[PDB]
Design a protein around this ligand. Structure first.
Ligand SMILES: O=C(O)C[C@H](c1ccc2c(c1)OCCO2)c1ccc2ccc(OCC(=O)NC3CCCCC3)cc2c1
Length: 290
């Protein structure tokens, strides 16, 4: 009990510093401490009850600065603190957590599209590089299932991708997996039960409402019910057995919609609206602030 969906940063006209938290139990939103630096294209994750904001870019009227930053938010204090920075700036990053370590995957730095991957150790406040992916990927979806790390889709600098790959930590090795049925950059990627889900994104032509899921045992991708809204650069998380998608861009509007997927019924429902439309947010779940 007492867990909230946190949304950090984002983009609307410029990169945003907002930290807002939604309570699925009562529908309430709270505005919390702003990020020290506005960022879009970042990822959020939680280790040990602390919320981490990783990477991104500060788009402002006075510049565009890709971020190598790792910042941690403590809900007990409602304060952000800087952590050790990554080896490189990574905009449109993907992040996953394995056994208390944060993996930062891909992303861009100017015209560079990274294949590099690095791993954060909160106990030592240190980053170290690990094996790079087989493909350069920005706007990559990342999720962790059964202590394996998946990198899904993205953009390699020339083509948007339907390919995906899996990292095996004990061998420090990446292997390709079955590609998705759809090309997707800027999808929301998460894990629910035994599947990796890829929701929305941009196929090079249109923003997508389709959603597909990879069963790690059968190695197949299967479509599920589509979202109500086409969305790229959406936020995504899982909470109490349901997927939540937040915001994004539908080709016309920066969305304030939040939709919830129920796997038992294979349906999406609109559950709330953010306080303003935005894309490129980082999202994660942790305890409510004190
Ligand atoms: O395919 C690609 O080139 C990369 C891809 C991408 C680029 C251009 C697009 C697009 C998708 O769809 C709409 C058409 O223009 C991508 C993917 C993930 C992102 C994640 C965060 C993020 O943060 C900052 C952010 O929201 N900016 C938005 C500006 C207004 C709409 C697009 C993103 C950006 C991401 C961008």
């Amino acid at each position: 009990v007492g867990r909230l969906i946190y949304t950090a940063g984002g983009y609307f006209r410029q990169s945003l510093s907002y930290l807002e938290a939604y309570n699925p139990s009562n529908g309430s939103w709270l505005r919390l401490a702003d990020l020290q630096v506005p960022r879009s294209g970042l990822a959020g994750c939680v280790v040990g009850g602390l919320l981490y904001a990783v990477g991104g870019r500060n788009n402002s009227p006075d510049g565009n600065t890709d971020s190598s930053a790792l910042d941690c938010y403590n809900p007990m204090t409602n304060q952000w603190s800087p952590c050790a920075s990554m080896s490189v700036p990574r905009n449109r990053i993907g992040v996953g957590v394995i056994d208390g370590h944060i993996y930062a995957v891909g992303g861009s730095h100017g015209c560079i599209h990274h294949s590099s991957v690095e791993r954060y150790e909160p106990e030592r406040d240190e980053w170290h590089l690990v094996a790079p992916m087989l493909t350069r990927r920005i706007g990559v979806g990342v999720a962790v299932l059964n202590r394996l790390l998946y990198a899904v889709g993205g953009f390699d600098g020339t083509n948007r991708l339907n390919s995906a790959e899996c990292y095996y930590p004990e061998r420090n090795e990446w292997r390709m997996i079955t590609p998705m049925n759809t090309i997707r950059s800027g999808a929301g990627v998460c894990v629910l039960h035994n599947c990796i889900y890829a929701a929305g994104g941009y196929d090079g032509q249109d923003q997508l409402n389709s959603v597909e899921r990879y069963d790690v045992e059968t190695e197949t991708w299967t479509f599920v019910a589509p979202m109500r809204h086409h969305r790229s650069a959406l936020g995504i998380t899982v909470h109490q057995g349901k997927i939540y998608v937040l915001g994004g861009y539908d080709g016309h509007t920066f969305l304030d919609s939040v939709e919830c997927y129920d796997p038992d019924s294979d349906t999406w429902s609109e559950v709330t609206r953010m306080t303003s439309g935005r894309s490129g947010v980082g999202v994660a779940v942790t305890m409510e602030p004190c």
